[model samples]
Target chain A: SYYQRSDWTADEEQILLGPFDYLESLPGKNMRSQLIQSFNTWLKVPTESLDVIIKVISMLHTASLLIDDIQDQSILRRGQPVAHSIFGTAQAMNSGNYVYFLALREVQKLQNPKAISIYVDSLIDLHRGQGMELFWRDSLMCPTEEQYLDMVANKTGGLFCLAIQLMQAEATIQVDFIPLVRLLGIIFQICDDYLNLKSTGLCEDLTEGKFSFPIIHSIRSNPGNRQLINILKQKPREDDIKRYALSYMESTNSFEYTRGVVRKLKTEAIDTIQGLEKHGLEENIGIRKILARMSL
Target chain B: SYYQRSDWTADEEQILLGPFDYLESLPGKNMRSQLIQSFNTWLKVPTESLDVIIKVISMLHTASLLIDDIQDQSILRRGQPVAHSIFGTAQAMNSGNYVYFLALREVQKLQNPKAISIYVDSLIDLHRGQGMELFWRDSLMCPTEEQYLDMVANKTGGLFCLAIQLMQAEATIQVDFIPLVRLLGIIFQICDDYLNLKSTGLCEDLTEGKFSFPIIHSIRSNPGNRQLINILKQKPREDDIKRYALSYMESTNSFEYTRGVVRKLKTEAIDTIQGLEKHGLEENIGIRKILARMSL
Candidate 1:
């Protein structure tokens, strides 16, 4: 009765949500949903609980995308302009964070106290992982391979753990799939780093100065070679400089090394699923097929 | 074990936390703490529980302040350069949201499911309220008085409600202090708006394009004028146009009208406290004194 146009038709409802609405409208990789479904084939959480889990996961992922775009200084998301590019940093940030809280409310609907715990811990690890990434970039400190993978386990694996952990919680069963899930997360992130360099034409890592998986390998391969680190230090805008950095990385065979790392991790993951399957877990060809698709 | 600098001395934690840390280091009005202490006089919650509550509100408000500075495009917070200027926008936005999750994790320690719901509900209202403001600003649409107040209820009242409602839940008793808390919310928000308009700094809200209390009153006073609305649309940085808008507001008696309303609201709030006190609650002179301090 107060605002009168209560059906959300009024202009009152949208501006804050502009960035959130905009980003959500675009076609994303939809990888989380695929992962959820694949993992669900094993957890087999009922539709009611599964749907709620789906809703929570998607909301969080979408919201993070909006926030990530702002922090990453991204221009395009999935072939379109990023939400922050249009909705302004403030709204996009507030709205995305708003979605995070909204996801928590949905978690409350589960009525399982453990679900809230899962949500909180996942977010904690998630932030820690992201914090490290930001720190490394800002400080111009390239992380080692082990440190990088550990960070991925927290940052990327955080959500992966959340989805399956919630499924197991709601399903009222427990399984030791965390390592496999974490391995998959590393594969995903490493693959993404490789794919991003390829997609963004190999300049994103050098320009963004990210201590990406390949970049990390390249940097650690020779500590005295300060040129690569220096190029990252300036975050070179000169394509010529970026080109030189890419050539240096090429000399290091970083991309091929990244591909090899992913292949190795993929094998470990496949063995994990097979061991589970051998012990009376479902064949889970569903997840197996999904992993196959992610192969570089 | 991986990153080597386990003592948080590796610069990983600092950069991610720079915005939150900087803002947290700064001092402000500290009104929330004052109000919480005053409310605790009646509730008399245990020190342990109150401490947790204190931690939560502190975390949340501090995080919110970081985000607010970004969204409001504030240059100075507590007379210091805004954190985003130092930490950069990406880290600033992310650090703030990261604190938000930290706040949620603190809420989890409360172990009272109701507290999580309270946090969720409060944040939901908070975002909706904030979203509308951004909507109105970007779209350049002025809201009606009733609509503005409702938005105030959601935006400003959200946290206010959270503080008191959280106290009520932790008090182990159900006392209906919601209306009283909501009244104070309106009072405090309007007071901020009132003071913002009268500041020596040339009505910061005008250049910021905020539709504050008096702005709403002035716009409604003469919908046909088109002077103030157009001025606001331009987001005039030149002090001259801002001065002219202030002059128009004065000619429209918007300032004088705003004070009257503030006085009326404060009086209503005091009267309600008296009403609550009559029902065997304490005299609550503490709250009355706080209200008096807020008076124009």
Candidate 2:
């Protein structure tokens, strides 16, 4: 009677992870293997280890996305109705709960407690990101600009950090090179935020009202851009949102400003690699591939 | 930089013993204190320790209620419009998220992993309870009589189970005596459910479409109760819900059946205390008070 709230004979079979007798239940079944392969290619890790890493990270990704979708009342994602639309809201929330358990279960299965700490860092990052967005929108308690940048850095920059850290944990890359890989991730997130706000033709990400670094900076420099105010005052028509975005970009030289920041971050990221040469190991192919992907 | 999420900052604040400073920030602070004192009285725990316990559990209770209110479109609670009604859906969801962090943070502050585990168990119980309840209504899975009992036991009994477990852990009660306390919790939940569904001219807990054990059992047992079917078709007219509940009670004798179950559970609960007595802890005041509370 470990708490007597259970009927020992109660059927938890439906919820429990079961043998994969069902057609879609196998390991290679639902986009899992494909995602694993993509991650393996990106990290240049031994393909075998990628499956485990992908399983853990993917579950965490799904859990965060599920929570955000519910919070946002987001109707569609990736051109499909959201999970909450298909599964009832309660079940959807529980699915996020289930994924959390599943993700932690995978982390527990990792060979060391240190690996668990690494994964926990990712969880913390997701929370940071969620907190920053909410705090910005909910109240007029404006944080200082330094605090604001740090919030965005933690929120969006974190997933990239986890991506690299997970790779380092899985591989035998020169230990000194690990921090550099994480810096590259920070660069990636900054670039992403810039692009999300700057895109002209089809930016659902911006239309959904994410205030990225550029937009935040625009608001900061001008203090009271009427176009920005109009967007906030009335839900901007998609055309107007795009028009304001294009106009802001034309006026502010934001592209050049963002490009300068990205260049600085990327250079700082690469400088960490100089120490790898001390160990007599050439800069790894994996790091070069990542730098190339970002066109740095 | 500390590897925490942005959202969790306030969450950490909320969960830290009395971050909300309920006694200070709130106007009707006495109601919160009164609820906590009654809870302590019900469990027969010391009033001093009750401060920490009430603040933690009440935060959880409020958090879950907020989430459920938004999902179920409940417009009002405690004579005030719901948080979601005032704040909009996204803000309310974030508020709940903050409270969740607060609860977890409080658990961490207990400085004992065992106490934290009980809190985690409370959360699991919520998921299992809410998940199964939603499934009962939506999933084509019609559970058997035993399955139905387990669901209600989890939904209602889980928190009660945590209350006793946490008290024992904090009080440093002997390990073997814990089961007796948990059993008493089960009996309490069964009694609560019975009172909620019985036709006592009292308000019906299920009239709002929330399910309780008595109705669950009646539905399974009184197979031909068409009148009951009509009553449950929606939130029935207040009088119709009461009248139908009475007729259903007469037909199924669910009230007596539930009472018998409660009596047997209470007896077994008392029996388990003999072990504690044998261990020379017979005069433990809290244990004695809890047993006395369930004697009826």
Candidate 3:
């Protein structure tokens, strides 16, 4: 028995999970946990299935955040140094990726055949949207208003749908909740995009070279003006350059424009929820609670 | 049916696969393709199954390289700029991750129940090994020889075993090839680690802060002598420092030490092949040819 097989040591196990554990402990970062509780009323998924769904989603959500932090190269996320900084980019990333398979294994624990396909397709959409977003940000290519929402839908919406679709697979009630979920998905990301600049009170998005919703509007509002576009190309870190860019957006009323879009999307989600109720689904106060927190 | 489902755009697909495509085109990179052919002689896997196995293994190998390049922060790999340098780290990393899910998808197409578990467990092993390697590299921790060998078996062996294990799943013969495969896994990575130093007459392993087999031996050869270990901690780039380190390794006969280890492992692998042949397995000339290329 001179075979070489790996006995994964406890020490190596610590390295693989250290980044994930560190990232998870960062308080109240991205969306999850509560969303599952909120959507449960509408889907009424069995307690047994719901627990597994919750575990899988949390695993996926935490994994996604770790990857997002690395990709964005933020110095701080939620008032702490990003995991990659402490763990180094490679280990943090490898750990994050490693958990993805762990989550895939968790999904199989659901024992639903469709759960596998659901998980796969949702993850595919996630990357597809992320690819386009990175292309736009790095290529310095400005996407139109419609294109950005679609990207948000694919990236952010992918996760939102993954949760609900999985829940619906085991739910007692199986009416389509994706419309409202998808609408709210775009709303959450757009608000995040705005609040990032609105709130280091955070220039992180601008520093990370994101073409956020407001930034997109400002660029298109004056397509001939290379001022804002050039600022993004620099991925400016100098406070004065960031301040100046903010003022330019202020003049273009881009923040107000984003607020209006947020209001509109919020209204659409409420309407969709109401329509669903009228069409025989139960009234969902949990979703309304979730929707209200999503807006400014 | 006002559902929000992602329509993965053709343009976005281009962005997602761009890094992978560029990295793959960097001819004669890491091992695969041929190894599959060599092992297939004994596996006798159906044409249909063999093709899928090849595709999944190649996809994983390429994806691992992209992530490795990013983690190592290398300037050139296989004589060209790394994927991260061209496509940017975020997208390159994201794309590499995306392909992993795609490979998972490809594995499912095998229509074998065990294939999914094999793919998942093998991938988990790949990351586990990678995690420990990154741990040792970044932490400046020098592992004992056994620890290093186990890490290699996990990381490099993870992929080698992944290919054979996948083939065995489809093979009519139903024999255990993992012993031979795992041996070659450590051998390939050890040789690669040596050649990285031996050939730059490449100091990349040194530059990357890797504790290759020879380096580990040199460090352990004189525990209190901090000279070489100190150089690694610097992650030295100056030619003089590198030259000094190499000369130190030469003095310690670490290179010769590695060669002896390589020869011994090769002899063991040859003996194993003979044992399997005596047990009525076909004489794997393909593996012998492959093994010869692996020697010092």
Candidate 4:
């Protein structure tokens, strides 16, 4: 009993693979792959070093969700129990951190200064955005639309911008798409907020009292309603409370306003890309195809 | 009322700095800086890039401790409440991750492929070791001494190796000190394990049931001692069980064996450095001084 088996076994490798496999099982839009493909096709370069890019983006994307679930205290992600729920919080956090360094390792393989710069800058902004969100929730600090959009630009948009910027640098092309990517990020967050309200499944954003765009709009529009503030302050854990919050959002037309903002952002993003076509890249079909995936 | 202050004040920076400041206030050995200084002196190279290295290592080291505390459920670090205990786990985890990416940003400032590789490789190894330890704990799997040493080589050794390796690479030194670093790592961990049993103030490692070196030795040496395993498995919050475990360790002479192992590793580490002197660097005083800090 004291002297256990000394040699390596397949069982331990299976343990190491557990987290990664679980993350891969989650349903993802695979947006990173689309971005990689779009940029590669647009640049007309062989997808040589893009594997490292894909790996980094994929790992970082998955890792973020894992950590996000734990931070948000989310019970479900994509109709399944959050990784933290299944793996336990400590394992989930460690696994999330493990994959993050995996992403960084992949970045090193790129061996490009601009690529490293873009990755690092995006990661910093991402954390700041995440920090701001946590701060606002903890403090119950309500931000205006502009502030919310700015936060999204840092949190959600940083990844998109990093992906595009890395590809651009890889192709020796210098262009500024950050503003457009920021716009896309805002649109994405708004759409997500809208879905959180409409989806018949789990409504965690509302239950958790996350200050999403629609909720922000609702609070701002109905500042006189102490009931609204009280319900939000309560965190609306009960179904009836959440239903009341949802109906309150409906009454204030917050959902309608948020949908309008999303549409506006999507159009602006499209216009910015159209402007990019002026640089003689003719149509930019790859990016257009990605846009088509978005439900406007 | 809706349109608040448009620009940032110093207040916002304070929020961002809160976790970092809390971490900095905690007592730490600051071994990374010392290692950097020692290696820089040994190489006889100008320490122009030392700032970037220092910044990266310090940030990464702090970030890891922050996450490690959460994973280990450590309530206090260095006689102070851990960051998660003060900031909450969400903020603590986010802040930890934020600092990690910040370290990467500092690494980019180095703009050296070798430096990047050293940092990335060490980070990956660090995570792997962390994951393994967490895995073993969660599974309650008993590891052999060899396996435990392997874990230390990755988790504890990675940072020390990273610091020394980065400096050596920067100075164009072809020496491989990783094995020596690994030996030092084993000594460090064994010492920490020994102290956890000896110290009266706190026995977190025992209370947490971390399969520490001394405990592992007791388990292996006295396979018939079911009470030893039971007390550890109980994660004895009460002093009675903790006292019983300590006495049981004394009976098995596990403490003596672990202390012996630590001294042996330290001596081996010193011998490797002595071997380095034969290669023509007479009187490696700086490195020897660092070694002296370790109780052999």
Which order, best to worst by TM-score? 3, 1, 4, 2
lDDT (Cα atoms) of all candidates against the true structure: 0.82, 0.57, 0.85, 0.76
TM-score of 1: 0.50
- What is the TM-score of each predicted model, taking all chains together? 0.50, 0.42, 0.51, 0.49
Q: Which pairs clash in model 3?
A: A199-A202, B199-B202
Worst ten in a row by lDDT for model 3 chain A? A222-231
Sort by lDDT, best first: what order?
3, 1, 4, 2
Query: Which is better, 1 or 2, measured by lDDT?
Result: 1
Judging by lDDT against the true structure, name the best candidate. Answer: 3
Q: Model 1, residue A44: displacement in angstroms?
A: 96
lDDT of 1 at B139: 88
The CAPRI-style docking tier of model 3 reads: incorrect
lDDT of 3 by residue, B34-97 (tens): 7889889888889998999899988988998899888986767676556665557887899899
Candidate 2 residue lDDT tens string, B1-296:
76965554765555442322331233432333342343343345555555566667777766776677666555545545666666677767777767877677876655666977788787788779778866765443445656766775675556555655665566644454334544655566566666555523243444444455566666667554333433443443345345545555657877777777777776776566655556655344555455555443
Report model 2's chain A TM-score: 0.72
Q: How many collisions between residues are there in candidate 3?
A: 2
TM-score of 2: 0.42
Candidate 1, Cα interface RMSD: 12.0
> What's the distance in Å from true for residue A276, model 2?
2.9
Error of 1 at A160 (Å): 64
lDDT of 4 by residue, B47-112 (tens): 667777777788888888888998888766766556665556776788788887878778777678
Candidate with the larger TM-score of 1 and 2 = 1
Classified by CAPRI criteria, candidate 2 counts as incorrect
